C-alpha cells in the first residue's frame, strides 16, 4: 500500500433511518469489527451545517452499551424529544500516538 499498517474497516451504523415517535427509546447498532483492543467508539450528531457534537463514548440522555458478542454496540437515546430529529453516526478512534479515525456511514433519526 502507501501505508505499512494493516487497513481496517469503518464501523457500520444501522438502521440507515430509524423512525420512532416521541417519549420512546430509539436505538442504533454500531457494528465495529475491531482488530486491536486499543480503540474507542464515539457517537456523534451532525447538525444541518455538518458540525459535530459528541454525544457519548465507550468506554465512558444519551447511552452507549457494549454487546457481549464483542462486535456490536447499541446507541440509545432515552425518551426521545423531537428536537432530536436529524443525523447521528458513530466513529472509532485508535489509541496509538498516530491516532486514526474511521467514521460510519450516516443514518437519520
Amino acid at each position: 500500500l502507501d501505508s505499512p499498517d494493516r487497513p481496517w474497516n469503518p464501523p457500520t451504523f444501522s438502521p440507515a433511518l430509524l423512525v420512532v415517535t416521541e417519549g420512546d427509546n430509539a436505538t442504533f447498532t454500531c457494528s465495529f469489527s475491531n482488530t486491536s483492543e486499543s480503540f474507542v467508539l464515539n457517537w456523534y450528531r451532525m447538525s444541518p451545517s455538518n458540525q459535530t457534537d459528541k454525544l457519548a463514548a465507550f468506554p465512558e440522555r444519551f447511552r452507549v452499551t457494549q454487546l457481549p458478542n464483542g462486535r456490536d454496540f447499541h446507541m440509545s437515546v432515552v425518551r426521545a424529544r423531537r428536537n432530536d430529529s436529524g443525523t447521528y453516526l458513530c466513529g472509532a478512534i485508535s489509541l496509538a500516538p498516530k491516532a486514526q479515525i474511521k467514521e460510519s456511514l450516516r443514518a437519520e433519526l
Epitope: 505499512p4 494493516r6 486491536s36 498516530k98
Partner: antibody, heavy 113, light 110 residues
Framework: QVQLVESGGGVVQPGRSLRLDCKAS????????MHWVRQAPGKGLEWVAV????????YYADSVKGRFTISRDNSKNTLFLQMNSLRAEDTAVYYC??????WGQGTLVTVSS | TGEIVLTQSPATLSLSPGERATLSCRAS??????LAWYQQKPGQAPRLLIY???NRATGIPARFSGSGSGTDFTLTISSLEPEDFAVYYC?????????FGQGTKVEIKR
Amino acid sequence: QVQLVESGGGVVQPGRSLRLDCKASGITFSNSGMHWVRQAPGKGLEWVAVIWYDGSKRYYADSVKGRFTISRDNSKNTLFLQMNSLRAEDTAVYYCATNDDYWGQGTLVTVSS
Amino acid sequence: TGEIVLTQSPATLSLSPGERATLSCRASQSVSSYLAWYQQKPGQAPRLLIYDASNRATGIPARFSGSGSGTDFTLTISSLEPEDFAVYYCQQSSNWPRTFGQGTKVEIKR
C-alpha cells in the same frame, strides 16, 4: 502498557555481524508496520528500515541497504534487524518503532576492535 | 528514487518560558502533508507531537500545533512550558527512504 523492547545490543568488531530483536507487547503486532531508527552519539535521528505489517515490502536507508536486513515473525511478536559488515560509523542507539509511533527505549551498538 | 532533504531552521531557538516558539522545516521537494514533528529530550526516545502536518498525537497538549503543506512546514508552541526546551525533529513520510531533518534545539534564553 504497550511496550517495545530492543535486545541484542553490545560490542561488535568491524566487518562482523550482529542481530537486534524487538519484542512487542500490548498491541496486535501483525497490524503494525515496523521501523528501525538509529542515533549516533551526539547526532540526529536517522531512519534505518521499514517492514510492512505483512512482510510484503521492505525499504532501507542508503547507508545500510544490502548490509542490513529487516524481518519479522508475526507469530512471536518480534522484529529483527540483521546487521552485517558493520563499520565504526554504525555505532548508535537503535530504536524500534511502530508506524503509528510507539517507540522502544533503544539499545546501544558499538562497532570497535 | 531521490532523497528528500529536510532543512530545519533555525538551528537553535533561544527563548524564555511562556514565549511563543515557531520552528520551520523546508523539504527539498513536495511532501504533500506527510510531515511529522518529534520531540527528544537527552537520554530518551523521540516522541511524536504532530503527524500529517497538523494533527496532534494522542494526549499532546493544545499548545502544540502544526501547519503547512507541500514544502513549507511550521511547528508552533503557543506558550513554552519549561518541559518544552528540547530538540525537535521533522520527518517526511511521503516517500522511501524516510528522512528526518537535522533538528532544532529550543534552549532557555539568558
